[PDB]
Symmetry: D2
Subunit: 319 residues, 4 copies
C-alpha cells in the first residue's frame, strides 16, 4: 500500500541549509504527555481510546522556508472538530500553537509537517484531581508528500472508486478530520489494482467527495467547483478558492457529480501534504487536454509564492 | 462517555475465589509488545503506527473464565480471516498467536481475563530492519481483568436501549462491521445519543433501516420459538454463535438474516451478546417494555447455559497453565 | 385512508381570495379540460392507455403551473423546468416549448377557471401512435387544467400546520430516482404521509441517506434562523414556489442559503414553512411535537406569504393573463 | 430508445427445445380474441383498455401488481401470485376492492375471453381517483400475448450483463422492491446503462454494494453445488421460488441471502428468473465469461424442468376453461 528532489525552475523549492544534529530533537520532535522527545521514540499508551476506538481528531499544519502557513486557521478547525466529536480539549488554542511552534523550532526543520491530535485518552492521567483524561500529542517531522514534488508539476491520474464509498456524514463525518481510514485505504488499494495513482470516492448518493488525504476541485468555464458534503473542509482548498477568486474566477462549494468531473476543463487535488496537484487523467480518459491546466498552474504557482510573502497567513518560526 | 467485580449472589456469574501473588510485575495484567512481555500499565506503541493514524488494525478479544480459555481457537481463526480481508499481512502464525495469548494470561495470573490481540499495518520497517520485505505489520497482545460492557448486575436484571436516530452503522462498502475493528466513530455517537435519551445503550440501523448491532455487542431477539439476529453490517460474534448453538440445543429455530425495527418492537425477548459480559437481557426499547418487561424465559436459560459452559469440559474450553 | 391534499373556503380579510364570478357550464369543457392524444376533452372524460409506460413503469415527468385571478404564474419557468427534467429522464419530447405553453393556455381558457392547477406531463408512451413509423416519437404529452389544488387548506395556509421528521422512510436517492426530476414515484412520500398520520401530525419531512432534511410529500421545506432563509439543495425538487419565496426573502433583506439542512438546524429554527404551487406558503408551527420558535406563524413567513399572494395581482415578467 | 422486453401473438422459438407455443387458430370475430382487459366493471378489448388520468396509480404510482402466465392453456401458480399480490397491497396499505376468489375469476375470464393459450395476465390495484361513479381502489386486469424480457432464442443461447455503476436499486426504506411496483425510475436508468455499455441488461446493487435484481427479473447464481440469490431489496419472485424448489429437488443447496459482486464474478453459473420468459442463462458479466462461458449445466436442467412443469398435472398448474 529529509529534503526531496524538486523540479528545477518551478515554484517548489526547499530551503538551502544544513541541520545541526547535536540536538536529539533535530530532524523531528514530538510532544507526548508533557515531554518533548525525538520523533523516533514517541510512543503512546496502547489503552488510549484514540487507538482502540479511533476516538481522535487532528489537523496538520506545515512550515515552509521557516514559515508556518495558516497555523491559526488550522488550530481553530482542529478545535472545532474536537468540539463536534465531543472530545474535551486539554489545552488552550494559544497553548497548542505554542507546543506546535516548539516542536518545529526544536526540530530545526524549515520544511515541516506539524501534526497535533487530541484523543479521549486512556483514563485518569498518571498522578490529577474531574481532571481531563484527554491526551494531546504533537509532532513536527519532515514535510510530507501525498504526491511527489515532480508530480506536483507533471500531474497524476485518478479513478472514481467503484468498490468502496466514503464514510457518510451520519456514520463518521468526513467534516471532522479523523483517523478512520478504512474506506480511504480500500480506495487506495482499488486505485493500485486499476493502475492509477489515486482514487476519488463517491458518497452514498453517487456524488464526488474527496480522496485519501486531499480535496478534489475542478474548473469549468470560469468556475471552480468542489464538494460541500462528505469531505474535510480543507485549508488548502480554502486557499485555492481564495486564489481563484483573486484571479477573477467564480467558486462554488456544492454537489459535484461524476459527469461534472468528466466534462471538466481541469481537475486538481489539494492538501497540506503537497499543495495543489494537477489530475490529468480520470478513469483512463484525459482531463481536458491531458496536461496540467492553465488555472491549475497559476493557482499552484501563487500558492507556493505565498509561502514567502509577508501576510496575516504566514508566521516565521523562531529557531 | 461509558480484579474482581460485584456479582449477584446465587446467580450464574461468579468470579474465582483466590489471591493473586503480585511478586511478578506482570501479575494483574500482561502485554506483549514488539517481542517482550511487559506489565499492561507500561504497554506503549509507536505513535507512527498506521494502526493509530489510519486505524489500520483489526483484532479480537477472547476471554478466560475460572482459568479456562473460551473458544480461543475460534477467536484466532476469525481474527486471522478479518486480517486477510483487510489485507494486513500477519507477522505470526495461528499457533504463535495462540501461545502469545496463553502466555499473557499465564504471566498475568488472572483467572478471569479479557485477552485482546490485534495486528496493525505497522510504523514502517521494524528496528533492526534486516530486509526490505520483512513484514512491517505489528502484533500487540494484552491480558487484563475481565471487562463488562454491562455490569454483572445488569447481566441478571436487564438494560434498556434505544434505536439510534442520529447515527447509522458503518456500511459494508465503507468499512465492514464484519471485520472487528477500532473505527468506533458511529458507535461512540450512538453511545452519546443513548445517554442523552436516558437509556443504557443504543442499537444502530444500517442505511436501509435494518437493525444491526450496538457499541460492542450483537443484538438478538426471540419471537414465537425463533431467535433472530442480523446477518449484514454486524460482527459475526462468537458470543452470538454460542447463543445460537445453545438455542438450537434447546429446540428453538435460529435465523441469521435481516431484522427490522418492527420485528424488535413485536419481539417476545431481546438480548445483547458479547465476550465482554456474555448475554444481557434488554427489557425496554425506545421507552417501551420488551415483552413482559422483565428478562425473558429463553434469555435466562441461554445466559445460564452460557456461564455453565465455562466449567463443563468440552472442545470450547482450554484450561490455562499458570 | 390517506390525505395527500370550484371554490373553497378562505380566511376573510387575509391575502388569499378566489375570484368572484359565475362559470358558465354550456361548453362541456367548462370546469376542467384536458388535452389527450390531439384532442381537448372534459376533465372527467380524460383517460390514458393502461399500456402507457408512464403507468406500468412510472416512466413520466411533469410540472404543475397555477392560474390565480386569471393570471398564469411563472408559466415559462415551469415549462422550462419540465423540459429539462424530461431530457434528464431521456423521454423524447413530442412538442415544442411554445406548443406546450399554448396547450396549457388552451386547457385553462376552455375550462373558464380563473383559479386552476395546470398539469402537463410527458410519458415514454404505449408504443407506436395510432396512425403512426418507427420514425415518429412514441412519447405522450398529456395536459389538464382543473380547479386549483390545496395540499394544505387555505385556512391552514394562514393558521399553520404541524410536522414530524420521518423515521420509518427516507427520500429516494439521487442515484435511484432523483427528486430533482419532478416525478410520479411517490412510494416513499406516501409512506411518510402515513407515518405523519400515525404520529398525529399533518405532514412529515423526509431525510436522505446521510441524514439531511430534504422535502415533504408535494412541497419544499424552508426555515428561517437569525436573518437567513435555509432550504435543501440535494434530494429535493427545485421548487418554483421555493424559487419565488427566496426572491421575496432577499427583497426583504434576508440572506438565503440553498444547501444542506440538518435536523438540528430545523429544531433550532425561528420559523419553518412549506412551499408548493398547490397552496403557496404554509407556516409550520410544530415539529416532532415541539413548538417552532414561538409556536405561531412567524413574522417573516407571514410577510413572505402575503407578498407571494400580492404578486398574483401585480403585472410583471412573472404573470401572464389568460385569454378566456 | 428503450428496450426492456424483447418479445409485444406467437413468437419464434428454438426448434426441438423446451419452449414451444401451442398450434391453434384464434377465433377473431369476437372483439376480445387476442387480448382482453377488465376495467371498472367491463371486459374490453385490450387495445381499448384505458384508465382515468386522475388515478393515483398514475400520479403517485400508488399501485402494486403481479403478472401470472398461461402456457399451453394452463395457469401457472395462479394462487401463489394472487396471494403475493394481496400481501403486497396490504403492505402498501391499498384497500382491496375484491376477494381472492373474485380476482382469480377475473384473471381466468380475461384469459378465456382472449382465447390466448400462451398469455401474460397482469392484475394491479391502485389507490384510485376518488369516489367511484365506501372504497375508491381500482382493480385492473388484462390478459395479453405472453411477454418476453429476453427472447425465446436467448432463453436457450444466453445473454450478457453488466453490474450497473451509474444507478442503485430503490432501498427497502424508500420504496421496497419486496412489493412489486411500477416505480422503475432506477430500473429504466439501469436499462439505459446496459445499452450504453453494449450488454443486453444490467444487475443493480443496493446502497451497501450487494447484488439485487434487474429490470424485471431476479438474479441467481450457482457455485459448487449451491444456488444463491439475494434476500434484500428484491422482489421475491415466483420464478425464483420455482427454480429454488427445482434446485432442491435436484439435490442442490439453496441460500436466499446477501450476494456480492465478488461472488457473481466467481460463479459457476448465473441465470435470470422471471414470469416474462422463465429461466435465462447469463453467459457474460462485465465483459468476462461466466464460468465456462456456455449456458451452465444446472441452469439448463432447471430451465428444462420449469417448462415441463407447464404440462405436468400438479398443484402448480390449473387448466383454463376457454
Ligand atoms: C410539487 O408539487 C412539488 C414541490 C413544489 O414544487 P413547486 O413549487 O410546485 O415547483 C416540491 N416537492 C415535491 C416532491 C413536489 O411534488
Ligand atoms: C481526507 C482528507 N481530505 C483533505 C485533506 C487536506 O485538507 P487540508 O488542505 O486542510 O490539509 C486531508 C489531509 O491530509 C485529508 O485527510
Ligand atoms: C461491534 C461489536 N459487535 C459485537 C461484538 C461481540 O462479539 P463477540 O461475541 O465475538 O465478542 C463486539 C465486541 O466483542 C463488537 O465490538
Ligand atoms: C423487479 C422484478 N424482479 C423480479 C421479477 C420476477 O418476478 P416473478 O418471477 O414473480 O415474475 C419481476 C417480474 O417482472 C420484477 O418486476
Amino acid at each position: 500500500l529529509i529534503i526531496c528532489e524538486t523540479v528545477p525552475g518551478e515554484a517548489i523549492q526547499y530551503s538551502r541549509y544544513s541541520l545541526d544534529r547535536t540536538s536529539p530533537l533535530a530532524g523531528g520532535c514530538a510532544w507526548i504527555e508533557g515531554a518533548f522527545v525525538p520523533a523516533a521514540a514517541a510512543r503512546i499508551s496502547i489503552f488510549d481510546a484514540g487507538f482502540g476506538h479511533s476516538d481522535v481528531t487532528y489537523t496538520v499544519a506545515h512550515v515552509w522556508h521557516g514559515n508556518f502557513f495558516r497555523l491559526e486557521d488550522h488550530v481553530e478547525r482542529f478545535l472545532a472538530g474536537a468540539e463536534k466529536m465531543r472530545i474535551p480539549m486539554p489545552a488552550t488554542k494559544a497553548e497548542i500553537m505554542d507546543l506546535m511552534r516548539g516542536c518545529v523550532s526544536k526540530s530545526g526543520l524549515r520544511e515541516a509537517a506539524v501534526n497535533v491530535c487530541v484523543t479521549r485518552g486512556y483514563g485518569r492521567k498518571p498522578g490529577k484531581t474531574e481532571a481531563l483524561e484527554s491526551q494531546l500529542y504533537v509532532y513536527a517531522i519532515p514535510y510530507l508528500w501525498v504526491f511527489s514534488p515532480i508530480r506536483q508539476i507533471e500531474g497524476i491520474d485518478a479513478v472514481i472508486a467503484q468498490s468502496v464509498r466514503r464514510s457518510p456524514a451520519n456514520v463518521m463525518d468526513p467534516w471532522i478530520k479523523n483517523y478512520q481510514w478504512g474506506d480511504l485505504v480500500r480506495a487506495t488499494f482499488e486505485a493500485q489494482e486499476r493502475g492509477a495513482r489515486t482514487a476519488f470516492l463517491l458518497d452514498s448518493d453517487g456524488f464526488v467527495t474527496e480522496g485519501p488525504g486531499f480535496n478534489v476541485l475542478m474548473v469549468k468555464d470560469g468556475t471552480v467547483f468542489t464538494a460541500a458534503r462528505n469531505v474535510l473542509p480543507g485549508i488548502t482548498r480554502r486557499t485555492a478558492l481564495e486564489i481563484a477568486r483573486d484571479f477573477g474566477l467564480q467558486t462554488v462549494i456544492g454537489d459535484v457529480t461524476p459527469e461534472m468531473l468528466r466534462g471538466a476543463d481541469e481537475i486538481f487535488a489539494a492538501t497540506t501534504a503537497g499543495g495543489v496537484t494537477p489530475v490529468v487523467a480520470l478513469d483512463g480518459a484525459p482531463v481536458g487536454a491531458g496536461v496540467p491546466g492553465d488555472w491549475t498552474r497559476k493557482i499552484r504557482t501563487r500558492y507556493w509564492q505565498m509561502m514567502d510573502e509577508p501576510s496575516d497567513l504566514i508566521e516565521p518560526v523562531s529557531y
